[PDB]
Amino acid sequence: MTHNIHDNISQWMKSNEETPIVMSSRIRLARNLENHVHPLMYATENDGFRVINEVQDALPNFELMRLDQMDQQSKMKMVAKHLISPELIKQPAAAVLVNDDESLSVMINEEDHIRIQAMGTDTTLQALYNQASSIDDELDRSLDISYDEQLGYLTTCPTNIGTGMRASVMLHLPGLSIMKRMTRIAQTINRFGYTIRGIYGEGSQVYGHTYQVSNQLTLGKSELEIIETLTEVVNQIIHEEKQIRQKLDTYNQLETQDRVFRSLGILQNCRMITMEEASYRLSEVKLGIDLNYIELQNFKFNELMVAIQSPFLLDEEDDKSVKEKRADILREHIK
Amino acid sequence: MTHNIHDNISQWMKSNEETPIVMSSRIRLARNLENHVHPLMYATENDGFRVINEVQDALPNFELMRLDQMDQQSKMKMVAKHLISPELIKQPAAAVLVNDDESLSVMINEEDHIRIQAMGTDTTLQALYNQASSIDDELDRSLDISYDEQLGYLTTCPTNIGTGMRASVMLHLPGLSIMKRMTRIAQTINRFGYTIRGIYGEGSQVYGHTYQVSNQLTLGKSELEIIETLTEVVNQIIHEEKQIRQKLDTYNQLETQDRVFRSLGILQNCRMITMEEASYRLSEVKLGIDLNYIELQNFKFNELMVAIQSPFLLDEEDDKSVKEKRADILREHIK
Amino acid sequence: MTHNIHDNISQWMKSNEETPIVMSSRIRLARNLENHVHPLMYATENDGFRVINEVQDALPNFELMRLDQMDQQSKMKMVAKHLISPELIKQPAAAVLVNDDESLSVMINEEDHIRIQAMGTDTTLQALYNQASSIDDELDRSLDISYDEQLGYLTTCPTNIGTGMRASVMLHLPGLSIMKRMTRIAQTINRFGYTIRGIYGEGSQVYGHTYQVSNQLTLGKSELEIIETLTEVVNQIIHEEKQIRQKLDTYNQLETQDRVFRSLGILQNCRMITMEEASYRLSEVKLGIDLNYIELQNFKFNELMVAIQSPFLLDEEDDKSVKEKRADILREHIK
Amino acid sequence: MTHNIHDNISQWMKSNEETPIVMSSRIRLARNLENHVHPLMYATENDGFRVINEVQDALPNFELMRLDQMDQQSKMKMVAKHLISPELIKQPAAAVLVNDDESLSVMINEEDHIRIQAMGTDTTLQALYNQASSIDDELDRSLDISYDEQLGYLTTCPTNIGTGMRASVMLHLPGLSIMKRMTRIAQTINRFGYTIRGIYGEGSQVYGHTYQVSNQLTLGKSELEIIETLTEVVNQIIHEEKQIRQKLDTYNQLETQDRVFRSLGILQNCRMITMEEASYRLSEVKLGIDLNYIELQNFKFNELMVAIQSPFLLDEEDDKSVKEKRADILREHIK
Amino acid sequence: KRCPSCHMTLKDIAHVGKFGCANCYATFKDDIIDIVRRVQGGQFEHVGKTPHSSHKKIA
Amino acid sequence: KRCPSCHMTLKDIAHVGKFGCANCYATFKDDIIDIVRRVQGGQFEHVGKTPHSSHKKIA
Amino acid sequence: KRCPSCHMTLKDIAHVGKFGCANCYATFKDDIIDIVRRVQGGQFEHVGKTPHSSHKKIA
Amino acid sequence: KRCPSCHMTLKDIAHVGKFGCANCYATFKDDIIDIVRRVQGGQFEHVGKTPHSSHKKIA
Ligand SMILES: [Zn+2]
Ligand SMILES: [Zn+2]
Ligand SMILES: [Zn+2]
Ligand SMILES: [Zn+2]
Q: Which residues 6+ apart lie within 8 Å of G53 measured at CB?
A: A140, A141, A144
Q: How many residues does chain E have?
A: 59
- What are the CA-CA distances from residue C232 to residues A197, B88, C190, C237 (Å)? 73, 34, 15, 9
Residue B156 DSSP label: B
CA of residue D283 relative to chain centroid, distance: 17
Which H or E run contains A29? Answer: strand A22-29
Q: Which residues 6+ apart lie within 8 Å of D18 measured at CB?
A: none
8 Å CB contact of B269 and A257:
no
- The candidate with the shortest Cα–Cα distance to A112, out of A39, A164, A212, A167, is A39
What gap in Å lies between CA B95 and CA B52, rounded to an integer? Answer: 7
CA of B286 to the centre of ligand 3 (A): 76
CA of D30 to the centre of ligand 4 (A): 19
Half-sphere exposure of A172 (CA within 13 A, CB side): 22
8 Å CB contact of A193 and H42:
no
Tell whether the torsion through CA atoms of D198, D199, D201 and D207 is positive or negative: negative
What gap in Å lies between CA B270 and CA A258, rounded to an integer? Answer: 6
**CA dihedral defined by D252, D254, D255, D256, rounded to 10 degrees?**
90
C217 → chain B, closest CA residue: B191
Query: In what side-by-side order are the strands of the sheet with C63-64?
Result: C63-64, C97-98, C104-106, C116-120, C22-29, C165-171, C211-214, C195-197
Query: In what side-by-side order are the strands of the sheet with A116-120?
Result: A63-64, A97-98, A104-106, A116-120, A22-29, A165-171, A211-214, A195-197
CA of residue A317 relative to chain centroid, distance: 28
Half-sphere exposure of B69 (CA within 13 A, CB side): 5
- What are the CA-CA distances from residue B23 to residues A266, B105, B189, B215, B301 (Å)? 30, 19, 20, 17, 11
Strand partners, A28: A166
Q: CA triplet G7, G11, G13: central angle to 5 degrees?
A: 65
Residue B160 DSSP label: B
User: In the structure, do chain B and chain H come into contact, i.e. share 3 or more CB pairs under 8 Å?
Assistant: no
Which residues from A are below 8 Å from H42, CB to CB? 220-221
Tell whether the torsion through CA atoms of A312, A317, A319 and A322 is positive or negative: negative
**Cβ distance A290 to A175 under 8 Å?**
no
Please count the other Cβ atoms lying within 10 Å of the Cβ belonging to residue B252: 11
CA of G24 to the centre of ligand 3 (A): 5
Q: CA triplet D185, D188, D194: central angle to 5 degrees?
A: 105
C191 → chain B, closest CA residue: B216
Q: Which residues 6+ apart lie within 8 Å of C323 measured at CB?
A: C272, C273, C274
Q: Which residues 6+ apart lie within 8 Å of C158 measured at CB?
A: E17, E39, E40
Longest dimension (CA), chain G: 40
C104: helix, strand or coil: strand
**b (16+ CB within 10 A) / e for C166-180:** bbbbbbbbbbbbbee
- What are the CA-CA distances from residue C87 to residues B191, C111, C112, C157 (Å)? 22, 7, 11, 18
Q: CA triplet B227, B228, B229: central angle to 5 degrees?
A: 90
* Domain D17-240, second-level architecture: 2-Layer Sandwich (3.30)
Q: Which residues 6+ apart lie within 8 Å of B275 measured at CB?
A: B201, B308, B309, B310, B326
Query: In what side-by-side order are the strands of the sheet with B63-64?
Result: B63-64, B97-98, B104-106, B116-120, B22-29, B165-171, B211-214, B195-197
Query: Where do the structural domains in chain H lie, given as residue ranges?
Result: 1-42
What gap in Å lies between CA A121 and CA A124, rounded to an integer? Answer: 7
A195 touches chain D (CB under 8 A): yes
A150 touches chain G (CB under 8 A): yes
**Cβ distance A155 to A113 under 8 Å?**
yes
Residues of F contacting chain B (CB within 8 angstroms): 5-6, 17-22, 25, 32, 35-36, 39-41, 43-49, 51-54
User: First and final CA of chain G: distance in angstroms?
Assistant: 38
Which residues from A are below 8 Å from D158, CB to CB? 191
- Rg of the Cα trace of chain E? 14
Residue C21 DSSP label: T
Chain breaks in chain C (C to N over 2.5 A) after: none
CA of residue A104 relative to chain centroid, distance: 13
Q: How many residues does chain B have?
A: 335
What gap in Å lies between CA A307 and CA A320, rounded to an integer? Answer: 18
Q: How far is G17 from chain A (nearest CA, A)?
A: 7
User: In the structure, do chain E and chain D come into contact, i.e. share 3 or more CB pairs under 8 Å?
Assistant: no
A140 touches chain G (CB under 8 A): yes
**Model resolution, angstroms:** 3.4
Chain breaks in chain H (C to N over 2.5 A) after: none
CA of C48 to the centre of ligand 1 (A): 18
Mind giving me the DSSP string for B317-331? S-HHHHHHHHHHHHH
Mind giving me the DSSP string for D217-235? --SSS-SHHHHHHHHHHHH
**CA dihedral defined by B167, B172, B175, B180, rounded to 10 degrees?**
50
Please count the other Cβ atoms lying within 10 Å of the Cβ belonging to residue A255: 11
Which H or E run contains A64? Answer: strand A63-64
Q: Which residues 6+ apart lie within 8 Å of B316 measured at CB?
A: B322
The neighbours of chain G, by the rule of 3 or more Cβ pairs under 8 Å, are A, D, H
CA of A111 to the centre of ligand 3 (A): 17
Please count the other Cβ atoms lying within 10 Å of the Cβ belonging to residue C333: 16
| Residue D241 φ/ψ, nearest 5 degrees | -70, -40
What gap in Å lies between CA B266 and CA B243, rounded to an integer? Answer: 29
Please count the other Cβ atoms lying within 10 Å of the Cβ belonging to residue B32: 22
- Rg of the Cα trace of chain C? 22
Mind giving me the DSSP string for A207-240? S-S-EEEE-S--SSS-SHHHHHHHHHHHHHHHHH
Q: Which residues 6+ apart lie within 8 Å of D158 measured at CB?
A: A191, H17, H39, H40
Query: Where do the structural domains in chain D lie, given as residue ranges?
Result: 17-240, 252-334
Mind giving me the DSSP string for H1-59? ---SSS---HHHHHHHT----HHHHHHHHHHHHHHHHHHSTT---------SHHHHHH-
Which residues from A are below 8 Å from B254, CB to CB? 271-272, 324
Q: Which residues 6+ apart lie within 8 Å of D34 measured at CB?
A: D143, D144, D145, D146, H22
